[PDB]
């Protein structure tokens, strides 16, 4: 069998040396991932997605993304262990986790644990392939201190769960293969077969790129089944069919059941209507309950008395008979008009009647539509809401919000009383306004400002320590968001809620529909991200991706590989192809340069990793969606294993005993324990490790985002199509 004599050898070193080196490289990996894990205290890159997909799990709302559910459910499970409710939505990059406390440190720490645990799995993979402890340490170090693997595995991303599942798959398959070489159908053989299947299931349940890991293990499993089918293996067709049926069950059927199990959990957790509904059929949507917000949601009509609540501060739009001071503390002149403030407690001064514009044919009981002109009458003071070209108390650029008498507001000031419930999305213009479910900006028509409030500073004693309400000129700002909370004057007929009757569906019908929608949407979705990259640029790490930027501090997170390291990896791959071509040419000439044991290393573990790297690299030339450096990330874990291995093989006594005789011929004498030139090999590995570590330290400001770089220091790191922020 492939590398049978090599893989059945005892370990080349005592276990204490392996335990020493695995501990050191795991501690380095831990230090690199947990360094300043609380910073940036902001949403980074695809944390905007996975974070949201998690929350929606905690709220039980149905969403739909192009990725299997397992990794998002693992993130959501950490939130659930922290007692997080899903209130924070991660809507944009740069949102403060301090405003809405999402357990972001716990999520980042979970990924940092998985990224750290990848390193000892990689180490133990080479240990089980009978490589030296220093070789195992070096290959694992190339992942422990790679800038791309570090950046990805400390943020709230799926790739930490993907990469550990790929590492576990490679390790479990190597363990299975050693059990297969020693004694097939042992209890240990079954454990490692099903552990390979379980790990393969987690790979494909995280991302569909996991098919490349199935292809790599599938190829190796087929090659070994081909050896077991050979007569010279004395395998009675019945014994061969027993191998085939057990591998089919362990590597295909069981992993497929576990893949379906995650969709069954996903549909059982997500039992309420949500943002995913638009992607599914009406028959699928009939399986979903109504959102708690939609149950209490009532259409807002003209002449309804409403309370309007701010989304970020929970404050109600409020007014009372007190007036703005004729001058603010900075000496600016106010209108001396009636105060409009943000009040956090429900009272009679939160009540606004929604009135149509003067001269409209719109009667009582007609629904208010989004982006229609309206007037708001304060019920307690009998005044119209007004905004004008007077500056607000705290913000000189924002407008003071006040109220005017009915006579003046029906006279010359009529334009200044016109508001609109402006939708957050232009697609939602002309939809019916509903309480609790429809967010809007309260937009002033004449001056083109949105009503806004804040809770970092409260009005002085003349404003009762209430929140300021002002006209923000940055209309698109997400902090300008309001909702109608209650309709106070709701008719008894409009109070009656009719619950939707949830209709059941065949899990398999539900799964087939969602799966078709997943593949159809993954194939579509056409855009041009200022960071898409083609497969030919990945092994060189020629371009990266901006993950986060802070303009005030001139700080940034940039996703890029350890160029020195990824380039060691490449140069290796080329040297190995050269060695294989040279071995094939020399053998075809009757010249047997390489010892049998060197060939078992080359055509066994090194060829297994080389083909596995090919499976994770070449298929991307045949795809056409948007492709970003993360995928060379999986393949880099595999090629780091390969590099360590090939270089150890090189620094070994590779010479055949007799250059005219093929040592592969049965009964030929060959050297069973080729000497490794440990001294020059260790010096070589230390030199490469020091260069990779130097690069990691030099790029560490861009991995962590924690240090501001001068423009000359930024420009000094533009190595290739690398565009960095703050180079000017």
């Amino acid at each position: 069998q492939v590398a049978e004599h090599w893989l059945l050898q005892p370990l080349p070193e005592p276990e204490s040396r392996y335990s020493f080196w695995v501990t050191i490289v795991t501690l380095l990996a831990f230090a690199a991932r947990f360094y300043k894990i609380w910073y940036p205290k902001e949403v980074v890159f695809d944390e905007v997605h996975f974070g949201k997909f998690a929350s929606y799990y905690l709220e039980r709302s149905y969403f739909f993304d192009v990725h299997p559910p397992f990794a998002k459910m693992m993130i959501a499970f950490i939130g659930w262990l922290c007692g997080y409710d899903g209130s924070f939505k991660f809507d944009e990059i740069g949102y403060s986790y301090e405003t809405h406390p999402a357990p972001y440190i716990a999520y980042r720490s979970f990924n940092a644990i998985l990224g750290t645990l990848t390193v000892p799995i990689m180490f133990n993979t080479l240990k089980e392939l009978n490589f030296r402890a220093i070789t195992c340490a070096f290959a694992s170090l190339l992942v422990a201190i790679d800038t791309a693997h570090v950046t990805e595995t400390r943020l709230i991303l799926l790739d930490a769960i993907l990469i550990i599942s790929i590492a576990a798959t490679m390790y479990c398959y190597v363990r299975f293969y050693k059990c297969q070489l020693r004694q097939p159908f042992t209890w240990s053989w079954y454990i490692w077969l099903h552990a390979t299947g379980l790990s393969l299931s987690f790979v494909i349940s995280t991302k569909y790129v996991g098919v490349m890991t199935y292809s790599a293990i599938g190829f190796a499993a087929v090659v070994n089944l081909w050896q077991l089918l050979d007569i010279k293996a004395g395998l009675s067709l019945r014994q061969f069919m027993r191998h085939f049926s057990k591998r089919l069950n362990g590597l295909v059927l069981i992993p497929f059941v576990i893949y379906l199990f995650w969709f069954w959990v996903h549909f059982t957790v997500l039992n309420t209507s949500g943002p995913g509904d638009a992607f599914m059929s009406a028959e699928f949507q009939e399986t979903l309950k109504d959102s708690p917000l939609s149950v209490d949601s009532k259409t807002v009509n003209y002449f309804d008395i409403i309370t309007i609540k701010h989304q970020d501060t929970d404050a109600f739009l409020h007014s009372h008979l007190a007036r703005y001071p004729q001058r603010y503390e900075d000496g600016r002149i106010s209108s001396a008009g009636q105060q409009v403030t943000g009040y956090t407690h429900p009272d009679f001064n939160n009540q606004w009647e929604v009135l149509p514009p003067h001269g409209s044919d719109v009667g009582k009981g007609q629904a208010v539509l989004l982006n229609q002109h309206i007037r708001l009458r304060h019920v307690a003071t009998d005044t119209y809401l007004l905004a004008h070209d007077v500056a607000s108390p705290f913000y000189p650029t924002n407008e003071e919000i006040t109220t005017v008498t009915l006579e003046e507001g029906d006279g010359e000031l009529y334009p200044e009383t016109l508001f609109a419930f402006q939708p957050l999305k232009k697609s939602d213009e002309g939809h019916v306004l509903k309480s609790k479910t429809v967010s809007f900006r309260l937009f002033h028509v004449d001056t083109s400002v949105a009503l806004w409030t804040h809770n970092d500073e409260l009005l002085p004693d003349w404003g009762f320590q209430q929140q300021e309400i002002n006209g923000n000129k940055k209309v698109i700002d997400p902090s300008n968001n309001w909702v109608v909370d209650e309709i106070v004057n709701l008719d008894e007929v409009r109070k009656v809620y009719i619950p939707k009757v949830v209709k059941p569906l065949p899990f398999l019908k539900k799964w087939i529909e969602t799966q078709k929608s997943m593949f159809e949407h993954n194939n579509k979705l056409s855009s041009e991200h200022p960071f898409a990259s083609e497969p030919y640029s990945w092994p060189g790490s020629l371009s990266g991706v901006s993950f986060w930027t802070n303009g005030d501090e001139k700080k940034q997170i940039y996703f890029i590989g350890n160029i020195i390291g990824w380039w060691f990896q490449v140069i290796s791959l080329a040297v190995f192809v050269g060695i294989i071509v040279a071995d094939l040419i020399t053998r075809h000439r009757g010249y047997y340069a390489l010892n049998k044991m060197t060939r078992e290393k080359l055509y066994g573990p090194l060829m297994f990793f080389f083909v596995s790297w090919c499976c994770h690299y070449f298929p991307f030339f045949l795809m056409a969606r948007q492709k970003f450096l993360h995928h060379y990330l999986p393949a880099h874990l595999i090629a780091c294993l390969f590099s360590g291995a090939l270089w150890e093989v090189i620094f070994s006594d590779c010479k055949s005993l007799d250059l005219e005789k093929d040592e592969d011929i049965s009964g030929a004498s060959y050297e069973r324990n080729p000497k490794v030139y440990v001294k020059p090999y260790t010096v070589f590995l230390v030199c490469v490790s020091c260069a990779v570590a130097w690069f990691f330290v030099y790029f560490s400001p861009l991995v962590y985002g924690d240090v501001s770089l001068s423009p000359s220091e930024v420009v000094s790191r533009e190595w290739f199509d690398i565009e960095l922020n703050f180079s000017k």
Partner: peptide
């Protein structure tokens, strides 16, 4: 407003 280089550091798309 200052042009600025690179891009706004965007996310990747999620269907519609």
């Amino acid at each position: 407003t200052s042009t600025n280089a690179t891009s706004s550091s965007c996310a990747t798309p999620s269907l519609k």
